[PDB]
C-alpha cells in the first residue's frame, strides 16, 4: 500500500522536480482543510453541533453564536510593494557534457 | 494499491516536472477542503447540526447563528504593487552535449 | 489499483510536464471542495442539518441562521497593479546535441 | 484499475505536457465541487436538510435561513491593472540536433 | 479498467499536449459541480430536503429560505485593465535537426 | 473498459493536441454540472425535495423559498478592457529537418 | 461484468438445481483442458515447441520424443461390478402444503 | 466484476442446489487442467520446450524423452465390487406446512 | 471485484447447498492442475525446458529423460469391496411447520 | 476485492452448506496442484529446467533423469473391505416448529 | 481486500456449515501443492534446475537422477477392514420450537 | 486486509461450523506443501539445484542422486481393523425452545 509519494517509487533513473502551493495576501476565516489524510479501519466523528437552545423574553436585544468556529471581527490584510513568495524546484541529472 | 503519486511509479528513465496551486489575493470564509483523502474500511460522521431550538417572546430583537462555522465580520484583502507568487518546476535529464 | 498519478506509471522513457491550478483575486464564501478523494469500503455521513425549530410570539424582530456554514458579512478583495501568480512546468529530456 | 492518470501509463517513449485550470477575478458563494472522486463499494449520505419547522405569531418580522451553506452578505472582487495568472506546461524530448 | 487518462495509455512514441479550463471574471452562486467522478458498486444519497413546515398567524412579515445552499446577497466582480489568464500546453518530440 | 482518454490509447506514433473550455464574463446561479461521470453497478438518489408544507392565516406577507439551491440576490459581473483567457495546445512531432 | 454464475443473479424467488460432469472408467493420456477461463487485457504464450534438432550417423537405432507431454507406456483401467458415480442435485422451494 | 459464483448474487429468496464432478476408476497421464482461472492485465509464458539437440554416432541404441511431463511406465487401476462415489446436493426452503 | 463465491453474495434470504468433487480409484502421473487461480497485474513464467543436449558415441545403450516431471515406474491402484466416497451437502431454511 | 468466499458475503439470512473434495484409493506421482492461488502485482518464475548436458563414449549403459520431480519406482495402493471417506455438510436455519 | 473466508463476511444472521478434504489410502510421490496462497507485490523463483552435466567414458553402468525431488523406491499402502475417515460439519440456528 | 478467516468477520449473529482435512493410510515421499501462505512485498528463492557435475571413467557402476529431497527406500503403511479418523464440527445457536 504505497499511498502518498513524490519522487521515484519502484523505479530507476528518474529526474523529478515538484513544487508546492503558495499564498500571498490571503485572509481566511473559520476554514477547515485536509491534505493527505488516510484512514484505515478507523471510525471518527468530527465537527458536530448538537442540542442547542436559546430563549428570550421581554429582552431588548440578544445576539448569540454557536458553532465549530465563530469569527466576529476583522480579518484584514494590506500589502504594498511586496515582492516574491513562490516555490521553485529544479532538477537535473544524467548529463554527459563531453 | 499505489494511490497518490507524483513522479515515476514502476517506471524507468523519466523526466518529470510538476507544479502546484497558487493563491494571490484570496479571501475565503467558512470554507471546507479535502485534497488527497483516502478512506479504507473506515466509518465517519462529519459536520452535522442536530436539535436546534430558538424561542422568542415579547422581545425586541434576537439574532442567532448556529452552524459548523459562523463568520460575522469583515474578511478583506487589499494589495497594491504586489509582484510574484507562482510555483515553478523545471526538470532536465538524459542530455548528451558532445 | 493505481489511482492518482502524475508522471510515469509502468512506463519507460517519458518526458512529462504538469502544471496546476491558479487563483488571483478570488473571494469564496461557505464553499466545499473535494479534489482527489477515494473511498474503499467506507461508510460516511457528511453535512446534515436535522431537527431545527424556531418560534416567535409578539416579538418585533427575529433573524436566525442555521447551516453547515453561515457567513453574514463582507468578503471583499481589492487589487491594483498586481502581477504574476501562475504555475509553470518545464521538462526536457533525451536531447543529443552533437 | 488505473483510474486517474496524467502522463505515461503502460507506455513507452512519450512527451506529455498537461496544463490545469486558472481563475482570475472569481467570486463564488456557497458552491460545491468534486474533482477526481472515486468510490468503491462505499455508502455515503451527503448534504441533507431534514425536519425544519418555523412558527410566527403576532410578530412584526421574521427572517430565517436554513441550509447546507448560508451566505448573507457581500462577496465582491475588484481588480485594476492586474496581469498574469496562467498555467503553462512545456515538454520536449527525443531531439537529435547534430 | 483504465478510466481517466491524459497522455499515453498502452501506447508508444507519442507527443501529447493537453490544456485545461480557464475562468476570468466569473461570479457563481450556489452551484454544484462534478468533474471526473467514478462510482463502483457504491450507494449514495446526496442533496435532499425533506419535511419542511412553515406557519404564520397574524404576523406582519415572514421571509424564510430552506435549501442545500442559500445565497441572499451580492456576488459581484469588477475588472478593469486585466490581462492574461490562460492555460497553455506545448509539446515537441522526435525531432531530427541535422 | 477504457472510458475517458485524451491522447494515445493502444496506439503508436501519435501527435495529439487537445484544448479545453474557457469562460470570460460568466454569471451562473444555482446551476448543476456533471462532466466525466461514470457509474458502475451503483445506486444513487440526488436532489430531491419532499414533504413541504406552508400555512398562512391573517398574515400580511409571507415569502418562502425551498429548493436544492436558493439564490435571492445579485450575481453581477462587470468587465472593461479585459484581454485574454483562452486555452492553447500545440503539439509537434516526427519532424526531420535536414 | 457478471461472467460465470450458477444460481440467481439479479433475480428473485428462484429454485435452481444444477448438476455437474461425471467420469466412470476413463483413461486419458497427455490431454489438456480449460473450463471456465477468463482473460482480461492479458497476454499469454502457452505450449510451444521450438528449435529441435536430431542427428544420427552410423547408429543402429534412435528413438526420440519431444513435446509438451510425452506418454510412452500403458494407461489402463479395469472395472468389474462397479456401481454408482453420479452427481445429483435436488431443489424444492415455495411449497404451501396446507 | 462478479466472476465465479455458485448461489445467490444480488438476489433475493433463492433455493439453490449445486453438485460437482465425480471420478471413479480414472487413470490420467501427463494431463493439464485449468478450472476457474482468471487473468487481469497479467502476462504469462507457460509450458515451452526450446533448444533441444540430440546426436548419435556409431551407437547401438539411444532412447530420449524431452517434454513438460514424461511418463514411461504403467498407470493402471483395477476395481472390483466398488460402490459409491457421487456428489449429492439437496436444498429446501420457504415451505409452509400448516 | 467479487471473484470466487459459494453462497450468498449481496443477497437476502437464501438456502444454498454446494457439493464438491470426488475421487475413488484414481491413478494420476505427472499431471498439473489449477483450480481457482486469479492473477492481477502479475507476470509469470512456468514450466519451461530449455537448452538440452545429449551426445552418444560408440555406446551400447543410452536412456535419458528430461522434463518438468519424469515418472518411470508403476502407479497402480487395486480396490475390492470398497464402499463410499462422496460429498453430500444438505440445506434447509425458512420452514414454518405449524 | 472479495476473492475467495464460502458462505455469506454482504448478505443476510442465509443457510449455506458446502462440502469438499474426497480421495479414496489414489496414487499420484510427480503431480503439481494449485487451489486458491491469487497473485497481485507479483512476478514469479516456477519450475524451469535449463542447460542440461549429457555425454557418453564407449560406455555400455547410461540412464539419466533430470526434471522438477523424478519418480523411478512403485507407487501402489491396495484396499480391501474399506468403507467410508466422504465430506458431509448439513445446515438448517430459520425453522418455526410451533 | 477480504481474500479467504469461510463463514459470514460483512453479513447478518447466517447458518454456515463447511467440510474439508479427506484422504483414505493415498500414496503420493514427489508431488507439490499450494492451497490458499496469496502474493502481493512479491517476487519469487521456485523450483529450478540449472547447469547439469554428466560424462561417461568406458564405464559399464551409470545411473543418475537430478531434480527437485527424486524418489527411487517403493511407496505402498495396504488396507484391510478400515472404516471411517470423513469430515462432517453440522450447523443449526434460529430455531423456534414452541 | 482480512486474508484468512474461519468464522464471523465484520458480521452479526452467525452459527458457523467448519471441519478440516483427514488422512488415514497415507504414504507420502518427498512432497512439498503450502497451505495458507501470504507474501507481501517479499522476495524469495526456494528449491533450486544448480551446477551439478558427474564424471565416470572405466568404472563398473555409479549411482548418484541429487535433489531437494532424495528418497531411496521403502515407505509403507499397513492397516487392519482400523476405525475412525475424522474431523467433526457441530454448531448450534439462537434456539428458543419454549
Ligand atoms: C509501456 C512499456 C513500459 C515498459 N517498462 C519497462 C521497464 C520498466 C522498469 C524496469 C526496471 C525497473 O527497475 C523499473 Br523502476 C522499471 S519495459 C516496457 C515496455 C513498454 N512497452 C509498451 C513496449 C511495447 O513495445 C515493445 C518494445 F517495443
Ligand atoms: C521564459 C520563461 C520566463 C519565466 N519567468 C518567470 C518568472 C518567475 C518569477 C518572477 C518574479 C517573482 O517574484 C517570482 Br516568485 C517568480 S517563470 C518563467 C518560465 C519561462 N519559461 C516557460 C521557460 C521555459 O523553460 C524551458 C524548459 F525547457
Ligand atoms: C514564451 C513564454 C513566455 C513565458 N513568460 C512567462 C511569465 C512568467 C512570469 C512572469 C512574471 C511573474 O511575476 C511570474 Br509569477 C511569472 S511563462 C512563459 C512561457 C513561455 N513559453 C510558452 C515558452 C515555451 O517553452 C518551450 C518549451 F519547449
Ligand atoms: C506496457 C505495459 C508495461 C507495464 N509495466 C509494468 C511495471 C510493472 C512493475 C512491477 C513491479 C515493479 O517493481 C516495477 Br519497477 C514494475 S505494468 C505494465 C503494463 C503494461 N501494459 C501494456 C498494460 C496494458 O493493459 C493494461 C490493462 F489496463
Ligand atoms: C508565443 C507564446 C507566448 C507566450 N506568452 C506567455 C505569457 C506568459 C506570462 C506573462 C506574464 C505573466 O505575468 C505571466 Br503569470 C505569464 S505564455 C506563451 C506561450 C507562447 N507559445 C504558444 C509558444 C509555443 O511554444 C512552443 C512549444 F513547442
Ligand atoms: C484527468 C484527471 C486528472 C486528475 N489528476 C488528479 C491528481 C490527483 C493527485 C492529488 C494529490 C497528489 O499528491 C497527487 Br501526486 C495527485 S485528480 C484528476 C482527475 C482527472 N479527471 C477526472 C479528468 C479526466 O481527464 C480527461 C482525460 F481524457
Ligand atoms: C452499492 C451498495 C453499497 C452498499 N454498502 C453497504 C454498507 C456499507 C458499509 C456499512 C458499514 C460499514 O462500517 C462500512 Br465501512 C460500509 S450496503 C450497500 C448496498 C449497495 N447496493 C444495493 C447498490 C446496488 O446498486 C445497484 C445499481 F447499480
Ligand atoms: C471494477 C474493478 C475493481 C477492482 N478493484 C481492485 C482492488 C484491488 C486492491 C488491491 C490491493 C488492496 O490492498 C486493495 Br484495498 C485493493 S482491482 C479491480 C479491478 C476491477 N476491474 C477489472 C473491473 C473491470 O470490469 C468492469 C466490468 F464490470
Ligand atoms: C500484462 C502485463 C504485465 C506485465 N508485468 C510486468 C512486470 C511485472 C513485475 C516486475 C517486477 C516485479 O518485482 C514485480 Br512484483 C512485477 S511487465 C508486463 C507486461 C504486460 N503486458 C504486455 C500486458 C499487455 O496487455 C495489457 C492489456 F491487455
Ligand atoms: C466456483 C469456484 C469456487 C471456488 N472456491 C474456492 C475456495 C477457495 C478457498 C481456499 C482456501 C480457503 O481457506 C477458503 Br475459506 C476458500 S476456489 C474456487 C473456484 C471456483 N471456480 C473457478 C469455479 C466457478 O464456479 C462456477 C460458478 F458458476
Ligand atoms: C445487496 C448488497 C448488499 C451489500 N452489503 C454489503 C455490506 C457491506 C459492509 C461493509 C462493512 C461492514 O463492516 C459490514 Br458488517 C458490511 S456490500 C453489498 C452490496 C450489495 N449489492 C446489491 C451489490 C450488487 O452489485 C455489486 C456489483 F458487483
Ligand atoms: C435418498 C438418498 C440416499 C443417499 N444415500 C447416500 C449414501 C451415503 C453413503 C453411504 C455409505 C458411505 O460409506 C458413504 Br462415505 C456415504 S447419499 C444419499 C442421498 C439421497 N437423497 C438424494 C436424498 C435427497 O435429499 C433430500 C433433500 F431435500
Ligand atoms: C439419506 C442419507 C444417508 C447418508 N449416509 C451417509 C453415510 C455416511 C458415512 C457412513 C460411514 C462412514 O464410515 C462414513 Br466416513 C460416512 S451420508 C448420507 C446423506 C443422506 N442424505 C442425502 C440425507 C439428506 O439430508 C437432509 C438435508 F436436508
Ligand atoms: C443482499 C442484501 C444484503 C443485506 N445486508 C444487510 C445488512 C448486513 C449487516 C448489517 C449489520 C452487520 O453488523 C453486519 Br456483520 C451485516 S441488509 C441487506 C439487504 C440485501 N438485499 C435486499 C439484496 C437484495 O438483492 C438486491 C437485488 F437483487
Ligand atoms: C444420515 C447421515 C448419516 C451419517 N453417517 C455418518 C458416519 C460418520 C462416521 C462413522 C464412522 C466413523 O469412523 C467416522 Br470417522 C465417521 S456422517 C452422516 C451424515 C448423515 N446425514 C446426511 C444427516 C443429515 O443431517 C441433517 C442436517 F440437517
Swiss-Prot record, chains A, B, C, D, E, F, G, H, I, J, K, L:
One of its GO terms (molecular function) is tau protein binding. It comes from the Eukaryota. Changing residue 57 to K: Increases oligomerization. The modification Phosphoserine is found at residue 87. One of its GO terms (cellular component) is synaptic vesicle membrane. It is found in: Cytoplasm; Membrane; Nucleus; Synapse. Changing residue 35 to K: No effect on oligomerization. Residues 20-67 are annotated as: 4 X 11 AA tandem repeats of [EGS]-K-T-K-[EQ]-[GQ]-V-X(4). Signal peptide: none annotated. Sequence repeats lie at residues 20-30, 31-41, 42-56, 57-67. Highly expressed in presynaptic terminals in the central nervous system. Expressed principally in brain. Its main location: cytoplasm. The keyword Metal-binding applies. The modification N-acetylmethionine is found at residue 1. GO terms for biological process: adult locomotory behavior; amyloid fibril formation; behavioral response to cocaine; cellular response to copper ion; cellular response to epinephrine stimulus; cellular response to fibroblast growth factor stimulus; cellular response to oxidative stress; chemical synaptic transmission. Phosphorylated, predominantly on serine residues. Phosphorylation by CK1 appears to occur on residues distinct from the residue phosphorylated by other kinases. Hallmark lesions of neurodegenerative synucleinopathies contain alpha-synuclein that is modified by nitration of tyrosine residues and possibly by dityrosine cross-linking to generated stable oligomers. Cu cation binds at residues 2, 50. Keywords: Acetylation, Alzheimer disease, Amyloid, Cell projection, Copper, Cytoplasm, Disease variant, Membrane, Metal-binding, Neurodegeneration, Nucleus, Parkinson disease, Parkinsonism, Phosphoprotein, Repeat, Secreted, Synapse, Ubl conjugation. Changing residue 39 to F: No effect on osmotic stress-induced phosphorylation. Changing residue 53 to T: In PARK1; no effect on osmotic stress-induced phosphorylation; increases oligomerization. The 'non A-beta component of Alzheimer disease amyloid plaque' domain (NAC domain) is involved in fibrils formation. The middle hydrophobic region forms the core of the filaments. The C-terminus may regulate aggregation and determine the diameter of the filaments. Neuronal protein that plays several roles in synaptic activity such as regulation of synaptic vesicle trafficking and subsequent neurotransmitter release. Participates as a monomer in synaptic vesicle exocytosis by enhancing vesicle priming, fusion and dilation of exocytotic fusion pores. Mechanistically, acts by increasing local Ca(2+) release from microdomains which is essential for the enhancement of ATP-induced exocytosis. Soluble monomer. Homotetramer. A dynamic intracellular population of tetramers and monomers coexists normally and the tetramer plays an essential role in maintaining homeostasis. Interacts with UCHL1. Interacts with phospholipase D and histones. Interacts (via N-terminus) with synphilin-1/SNCAIP; this interaction promotes formation of SNCA inclusions in the cytoplasm. Interacts with CALM1. Interacts with STXBP1; this interaction controls SNCA self-replicating aggregation. Interacts with SNARE components VAMP2 and SNAP25; these interactions allows SNARE complex assembly and integrity. It is linked to Genetic alterations of SNCA resulting in aberrant polymerization into fibrils, are associated with several neurodegenerative diseases (synucleinopathies). SNCA fibrillar aggregates represent the major non A-beta component of Alzheimer disease amyloid plaque, and a major component of Lewy body inclusions. They are also found within Lewy body (LB)-like intraneuronal inclusions, glial inclusions and axonal spheroids in neurodegeneration with brain iron accumulation type 1. Parkinson disease 1, autosomal dominant: A complex neurodegenerative disorder characterized by bradykinesia, resting tremor, muscular rigidity and postural instability. Additional features are characteristic postural abnormalities, dysautonomia, dystonic cramps, and dementia. The pathology of Parkinson disease involves the loss of dopaminergic neurons in the substantia nigra and the presence of Lewy bodies (intraneuronal accumulations of aggregated proteins), in surviving neurons in various areas of the brain. This is Alpha-synuclein. It comes from Homo sapiens (Human). The lineage of its organism: Eukaryota, Metazoa, Chordata, Craniata, Vertebrata. The chain holds residues 1 to 98 of 140 of the full protein.
Amino acid at each position: 500500500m504505497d499511498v502518498f509519494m513524490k519522487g521515484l517509487s519502484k523505479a530507476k533513473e528518474g529526474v523529478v522536480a515538484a513544487a508546492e502551493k503558495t499564498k500571498q495576501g490571503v485572509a481566511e476565516a473559520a476554514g477547515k482543510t485536509k491534505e493527505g489524510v488516510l484512514y484505515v479501519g478507523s471510525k471518527t466523528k468530527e465537527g458536530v453541533v448538537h442540542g442547542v437552545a436559546t430563549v428570550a423574553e421581554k429582552t431588548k436585544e440578544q445576539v448569540t453564536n454557536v458553532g465549530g468556529a465563530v469569527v466576529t471581527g476583522v480579518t484584514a490584510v494590506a500589502q504594498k510593494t511586496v515582492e516574491g513568495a513562490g516555490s521553485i524546484a529544479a532538477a537535473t541529472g544524467f548529463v554527459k557534457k563531453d
